[PDB]
């Protein structure tokens, strides 16, 4: 039985490659080739925002456009306004060894994490003044690597089991559980509709969930080793991702194929985070060679440099509205650009 | 800004002060990552240590000579060590009196030999040797190992050569190692780890001005 | 959430007194505190302003030197310290709690006052006095000021409050937009600079009393005579 299980599964794989070389008619590169070159684009720190004790390791904006939300090792939880640098809350937490953090869509809430294995919610406008936890939820067996809200009441987790969840809060129950990677799971990115979202996991293996109905429908392959971040295009039908062999891809959903690479023959390092732009025309990457870079996402060139950090760039991201970019860094310093 | 964003700097600027009381004690605090496979020994020397200053990561604090020190006491463990930069020193602990030796001295080797670990001292604790003295009395052959010397006799022989085998598998020095025979007395194993991270920072010190 | 205050009376000429107000239920060391005082027919009036951290301190130009202010945060009381009384310090007394950061709203919860009896600055108006009205209609008053409101930074502070007949202070509209925790979705605020006017959709019984309109675009903080509705 177990001869024919795998000749089965080899003329599936067969099959499969088959219908995706099949349609590759085309190449990205040749139908923007005659395209304008988006010229040199140079940004100027704005604003610079100190305080942390030690290295920071998430961030995350608003939906406002203003305000931030800082993680770093020092167990410290900060609140920041970017207008005019001031300092809105800060919060004490209880494992000082956290990985990633997030920021509620209406604005009451906020989420953290770490090495002990529990995602803490925690209340922002309460009556008696104070920030109090309220959720603590627990059931995964090894950390956490990232968590995302959907609305006030659901949350989806990744975690190091090889395990992702999505998360009902009122009750604290888990409602369905996505199983199938083979090893540690490092990003996830949810969609602008709110209806599918993606996970890359740290095995050369990027897959895409339908949250509703509770199984898997596509897988992407490609990558010679693991994967550190992941993001949506602007549109719910693409996506680009980062490794560790100083390589980006960008993957589309409705052909089921990789449509382009980054890389350039001076980069040995690993990159640490991606995000886009408003119109998809801007993608940034954070690397270990102490900079963050600027591409097009067209044509796959270099536009530009955002130098100023002493230490490897950990955490980088985009408003709602277009403004500005935040990066942070190793040294504990904050910086926007425009 | 008038009349409300002057209340919002001041909110701000106290923040601050905290945040700067905070680094002026974080800077006194000495880091030290507890390993070892003897989960009987553990448990021994952390409940001793306890009553001398008397699962995920359990961290213990506690000082020895007014200095403060706190002890972390832990699958893809290469993310799982990216944490611990900041270390002083790494305390292992090992099994004597057994067997299960050849599996922990491929875990020592695959532990000190890190890209990550490079200015790390280790400290290296040996547990349980009365029993060890029991079992030498009852001379029990040695099925492999070239113990040239005393081997139908005491172990005062035998663990030299253990601490042989424990240097090797070592490729980089210029950072010593320590070695231990656990006693009762507790005081010996305070006294133990605080010469040895003493002499840690000293050698650290020496560099920046050129020695 | 309560605050509880003490230390009225009636007092000769001359004298001194120091009244207290003791906090249950929340941070009290996160706070601003506040002094307002209502005379026995007539419209409020700001007295006094204490601040988190003891820093800031602010009086009003008709008591200033004669009164004082102090905070104990471990034990939760605020003192107002006032000496050489005379005839024109008869009224009731309230304290008001504030914080300042983005997004708040100041002046979110008042206590029960007390009782004291003895034997330049923006001008802001109220239109009218007295309205007759009838439940199940729609209803509109205005107040007047005598400069622009609107800080270059976007803002605009004027504050609308509402007094029931035998009642304290509750918020119903802050920074001329906004409303409060706890209210009907049925009330609403607009203006120009230097012209106000809130507006009530589907009156309904338990809405008659007075109400006032404020000003905290820079201290001395200045009130308007009162407005009322007569059912």
């Known amino acids: 039985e177990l001869d024919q299980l795998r000749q089965e599964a080899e003329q599936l794989k067969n099959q499969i490659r088959d219908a995706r070389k099949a349609c590759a008619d085309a190449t990205l590169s040749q139908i923007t080739n005659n395209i304008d070159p988006v010229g040199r684009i140079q940004m100027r720190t704005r604003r610079t925002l100190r305080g942390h004790l030690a290295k920071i390791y998430a961030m995350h904006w608003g939906t406002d456009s203003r305000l931030l939300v800082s993680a770093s090792q020092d167990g410290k939880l900060i609140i920041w306004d970017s207008y005019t640098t001031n300092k809105v809350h800060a919060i004490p937490l209880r494992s000082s060894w956290v990985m990633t953090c997030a920021y509620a869509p209406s604005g009451n809430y906020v989420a953290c994490g770490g090495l002990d294995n529990i995602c803490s919610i925690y209340n922002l406008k309460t009556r008696e003044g104070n920030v109090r936890v309220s959720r603590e939820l627990a059931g995964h067996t090894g950390y956490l690597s990232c968590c995302r809200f959907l609305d006030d009441n659901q949350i989806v987790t990744s975690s190091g089991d090889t395990t992702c969840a999505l998360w009902d809060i009122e009750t604290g129950q888990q409602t369905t559980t996505f199983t199938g990677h083979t090893g540690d799971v490092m990003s996830l990115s949810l969609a602008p509709d709110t209806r599918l979202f993606v996970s890359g996991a740290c095995d050369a293996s990027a897959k895409l969930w339908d949250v509703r109905e509770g199984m898997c429908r596509q897988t992407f392959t490609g990558h010679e080793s693991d994967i550190n971040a992941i993001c949506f295009f602007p549109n719910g039908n693409a996506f680009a991702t980062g490794s560790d062999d100083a390589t980006c891809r960008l993957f589309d959903l409705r052909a089921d194929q990789e449509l382009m690479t980054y890389s350039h023959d001076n980069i040995i390092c690993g990159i640490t985070s991606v995000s886009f732009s408003k119109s998809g025309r801007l993608l940034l990457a954070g690397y270990d060679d102490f900079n963050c870079n600027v591409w097009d996402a067209l044509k796959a060139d270099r536009a530009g440099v955002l130098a100023g950090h002493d230490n490897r760039v950990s955490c980088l991201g985009v408003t709602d509205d277009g403004m500005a970019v935040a990066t942070g860094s190793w040294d504990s310093f904050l910086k926007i650009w425009n | 800004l008038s009349a409300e964003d002057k209340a919002a700097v001041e909110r701000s600027k106290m923040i601050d002060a905290l945040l700067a009381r905070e680094r002026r004690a974080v800077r006194r605090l000495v880091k030290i990552l507890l390993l070892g496979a003897d989960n009987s020994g553990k448990s021994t020397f952390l409940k001793q240590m306890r009553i001398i200053h008397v699962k995920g990561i359990v961290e213990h604090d506690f000082v020895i000579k007014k200095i403060p020190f706190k002890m972390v006491d832990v699958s893809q463990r290469q993310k799982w060590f990216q944490c611990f930069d900041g270390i002083t020193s790494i305390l292992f602990m090992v099994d004597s009196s057994d067997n299960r030796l050849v599996e922990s001295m491929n875990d020592f080797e695959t532990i000190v030999n890190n890209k990550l670990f490079f200015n790390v001292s280790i400290i290296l604790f040996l547990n349980k040797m009365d029993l060890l003295v029991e079992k030498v009395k009852t001379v029990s052959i040695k099925k492999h190992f070239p113990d040239f010397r005393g081997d139908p006799h005491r172990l005062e022989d035998v663990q030299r050569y253990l601490v042989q085998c424990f240097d090797r598998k070592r490729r980089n020095r210029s950072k010593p190692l320590f070695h231990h025979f656990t006693t009762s007395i507790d005081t010996e194993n305070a006294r133990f780890i605080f010469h040895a991270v003493k002499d840690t920072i000293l050698q650290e010190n020496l560099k920046d001005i050129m020695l | 959430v309560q605050l509880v205050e003490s230390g009225g009376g009636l007092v000769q000429p001359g004298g001194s007194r120091k009244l207290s107000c003791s906090a249950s239920?929340?941070?009290?060391?996160?706070?601003?505190m506040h002094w307002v005082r209502q005379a026995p027919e007539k419209g409020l009036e700001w007295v006094a302003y204490?601040?988190?951290?003891?820093?800031?301190?602010y009086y009003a130009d008709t008591v200033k030197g004669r009164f004082t202010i102090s905070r104990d945060d471990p034990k939760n009381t605020l003192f107002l310290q006032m000496t050489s009384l005379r005839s024109e310090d008869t009224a009731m007394y309230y304290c008001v709690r504030s914080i300042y950061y983005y997004g708040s709203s100041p002046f979110d919860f008042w206590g029960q006052g007390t009782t004291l009896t003895v034997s330049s600055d923006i001008v802001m108006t109220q239109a009218t006095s007295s309205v007759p009205v009838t439940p199940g209609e729609s209803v509109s008053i205005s107040c007047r000021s005598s400069?622009?409101?609107?800080?270059?930074?976007?803002?605009?502070?004027l504050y609308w409050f509402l007094q029931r007949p035998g009642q304290s202070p509750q918020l119903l509209i802050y920074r001329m937009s906004n409303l409060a925790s706890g209210v009907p979705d049925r009330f609403s605020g607009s203006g120009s600079g230097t012209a106000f006017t809130l507006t009530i959709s589907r009156l309904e019984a338990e809405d008659v009393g007075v109400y006032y309109c404020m000003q905290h675009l820079e201290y001395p903080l200045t009130f308007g005579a009162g407005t009322k509705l007569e059912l």
């Open positions: 239920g929340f941070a009290f060391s996160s706070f601003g």
């Open positions: 400069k622009s409101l609107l800080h270059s930074n976007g803002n605009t502070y």
């Open positions: 204490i601040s988190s951290g003891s820093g800031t301190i």
